[PDB]
Amino acid sequence: CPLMVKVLDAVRGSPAINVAVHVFRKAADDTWEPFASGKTSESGELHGLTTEEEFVEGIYKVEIDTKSYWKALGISPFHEHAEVVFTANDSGPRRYTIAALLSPYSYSTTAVVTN
Amino acid sequence: CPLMVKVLDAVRGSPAINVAVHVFRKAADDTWEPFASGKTSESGELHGLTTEEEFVEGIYKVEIDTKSYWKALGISPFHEHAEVVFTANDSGPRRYTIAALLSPYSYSTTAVVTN
Amino acid sequence: CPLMVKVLDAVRGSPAINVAVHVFRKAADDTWEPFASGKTSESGELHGLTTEEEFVEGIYKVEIDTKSYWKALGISPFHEHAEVVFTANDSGPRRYTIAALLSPYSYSTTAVVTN
Amino acid sequence: CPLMVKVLDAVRGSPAINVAVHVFRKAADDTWEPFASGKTSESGELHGLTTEEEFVEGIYKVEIDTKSYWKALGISPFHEHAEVVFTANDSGPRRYTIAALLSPYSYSTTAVVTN
Ligand SMILES: O=C(O)c1cc(I)cc(I)c1O
């Protein structure tokens, strides 16, 4: 489990549940190729996206479908989605958590990268 | 104006207007003595809290009355207020902007300090 | 375990380890009485602060000693500490996670309150 | 100026100066067409990206080159950039401020939208 995505809701003070998340890897021609996807659980987490074998060094994009999340709650949002773009580097044994904290007109995102 | 407070609303995507702000300074006796107060304007900014003369070295607390803000809009938020505590002017006079970005169950705060 | 505190480091992209955390409850005379304290673990979490029996309705303050954290890393910080002040309400079965994401001149804090 | 970009540095407590910003607009063919670009000033602000005439309805992407910013300061950050994607001017012209608060492993972004 080298990659996990976590989403929190700053309006309700809760995990953001059933948020669609799409992960892409940058291809040689510079296009974004689908890599993994899922929906956050009751805990706002998405586990099992990839394996150590498949998660090679490269540039990844995590798209979080914030607009549909807010719409499902009957709340008017600003962004189309939240996008997190980063390079995975084999600087020893590392697990990546990409987290996002959501408001209708704002989001924060951080990386928690641990052994 | 050596001290300015700026407040934004992350739900509406707007300045946070009419937010009450109370500033305290730690006294010789180690208690929080009233220093200044005001409310944010239409721009979400609060200017004119103090002067270069009065804003001496000290430990300051800026209390931003976020609960009263959300309640005046008919919303029940999590926090009582947002308190920003910092040492000021310990290396001579600086200009401090204390900024806060508000959601019902979350806030962010930053400082912009200039010479 | 009705209360947990989590602290993350936005500079290193890691849990904030060995951060001192002090929790207070507001007393009848309006003073802050010590309630619980600890240091965050390797995961940046502080568990075991209180019990269901002791965590009655009231106003609580969570003080996170951010200044000492940054100093121990050799980094110059802005704030004395981060303070989170909130009312605990028995609106059915609820667990409170108070989380903070730290930078030298900024922090964010959110509440995750779940059944 | 209907579109402004503001960037702050959460490590230094300062405007983020000389940050490159590229704006794209989704074309009829569903690709990201170059729209405007510039760099933040000493105030951390980027004005004059566009005009009321040219800033028509559309889906816009504001790419803030955070990696280049941190690298120019001799720091190795997590993200490649911060991308802010939103529909603009769908209910007539508005003024948009897209703001970002940067740390090496984290960023926050908000919008301030006025009529
Ligand atoms: O706990 C988190 O995963 C978390 C994530 C973000 I992004 C911001 C805050 I405050 C948090 O507490």
Ligand SMILES: O=C(O)c1cc(I)cc(I)c1O
């Ligand atoms: O524009 C601001 O003042 C601003 C203030 C905070 I606190 C966080 C973000 I993102 C901002 O953009």
